[PDB]
Amino acid sequence: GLMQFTLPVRLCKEIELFHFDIGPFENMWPGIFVYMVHRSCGTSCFELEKLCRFIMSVKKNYRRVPYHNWKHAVTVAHCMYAILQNNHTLFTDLERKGLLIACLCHDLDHRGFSNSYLQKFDHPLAALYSTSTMEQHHFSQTVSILQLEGHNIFSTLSSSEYEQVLEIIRKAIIATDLALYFGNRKQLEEMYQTGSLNLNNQSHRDRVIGLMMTACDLCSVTKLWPVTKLTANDIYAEFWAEGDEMKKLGIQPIPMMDRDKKDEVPQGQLGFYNAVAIPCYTTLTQILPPTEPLLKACRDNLSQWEKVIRGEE
Ligand SMILES: Cn1cc(-c2ccccc2)nc1COc1nc(N2CCOCC2)c2cnn(C)c2n1
Ligand SMILES: [Mg+2]
Ligand SMILES: [Zn+2]
């Protein structure tokens, strides 16, 4: 009970900031996560032994892929920690519990391929889950790990609290399907501007948590430029492998997945910032003003991609 995780001074300070990078020492990531649960949620939220066993089983079920890996999981959980810590009173006890777990689990057993590639390949998961294919799988894997002996970190919740937390996690994980973000953000945009947004309306909170999930998932664009740019290499390493696999099925991939079109990456990042990232962080900042640093970091990175196109780097 009296057993805190404590980080070295630079991490203790920087972990609080939106732009924190969890570093290249994989063995410190579990401790960074527990640290974040303890401060976000409490030292009482989870039995440490169960939580540690849960974390290590989650890690084992992430694959050695360039981007959708264990580092991504922990990175996405840290962005959520930063949102929760900057919005202390807006979220329920259960939400703080569910959302860090949801972020840690949101890409469980990812293979580095899009929903589209699974459908074109005719992967068995595409028959089991006709939309949000990988995301229904990520939630399935989360429930599987929760049911391993000694891994039920939620065991102390009442039956209805348990049903609620697993429903928060399910919705949060499904919301990371970017195909769903566009309409979620539009509805939030309309609701905020017509002034109908109501955080006591469960369907509204669901929407706001979905947008938080998109914001955490895309958070490479909110890092300092050298982190953003080096993370982009990992993202493209997967896209280009998928593109290669599309060419093996006899399908020209979209340019973003064609390694022969590497030259077009900077212009493609611009469209991404303008169509996805900037809108995401703008609506998030309208709803949750203290998340503004994410939008400011995203705008700085957009300006850095503009500099790449102008050959200024
Ligand atoms: C939209 N677009 C078009 C082009 C392009 C490139 C070369 C030639 C021509 C076009 N490049 C993009 C960038 O796509 C993209 N998708 C992301 N998603 C999240 C994780 O997986 C799926 C989706 C993320 C996440 N973080 N970042 C930076 C991302 N960038
Ligand atoms: Mg995903
Ligand atoms: Zn993700």
Topology:
Elements: H1 9-14, H2 29-40, H3 48-60, H4 70-85, H5 93-105, H6 115-121, H7 124-128, H8 133-146, H9 159-175, H10 178-194, H11 202-217, H12 225-248, H13 265-287, H14 292-309
Residues 106-107, 134, 176 line the site of magnesium ion.
At a glance:
It is found in: Cytoplasm, Cytosol. About 65% of the residues lie in helices and about 0% in strands.
What does it look like?
By secondary structure, this protein is an all-alpha fold. The chain has one domain (28-310): 3'5'-cyclic nucleotide phosphodiesterase, catalytic domain (Catalytic domain of cyclic nucleotide phosphodiesterase 4b2b), CATH 1.10.1300.10. It is 64% helix and 0% strand. The longest helix is centred in the last third of the chain and has 24 residues, at 225-248. The structure holds ligand IX5, magnesium ion (MG) and zinc ion. Residues 178, 218, 220-221, 232, 235, 255-256, 261, 264-265, 268-269, 271-272 line the site of the ligand Cn1cc(-c2ccccc2)nc1COc1nc(N2CCOCC2)c2cnn(C)c2n1. The active site is at 68 (proton donor). A divalent metal cation 1 binds at residues 72, 106-107, 217. Homodimer. 3',5'-cyclic AMP binds at residues 68, 269.
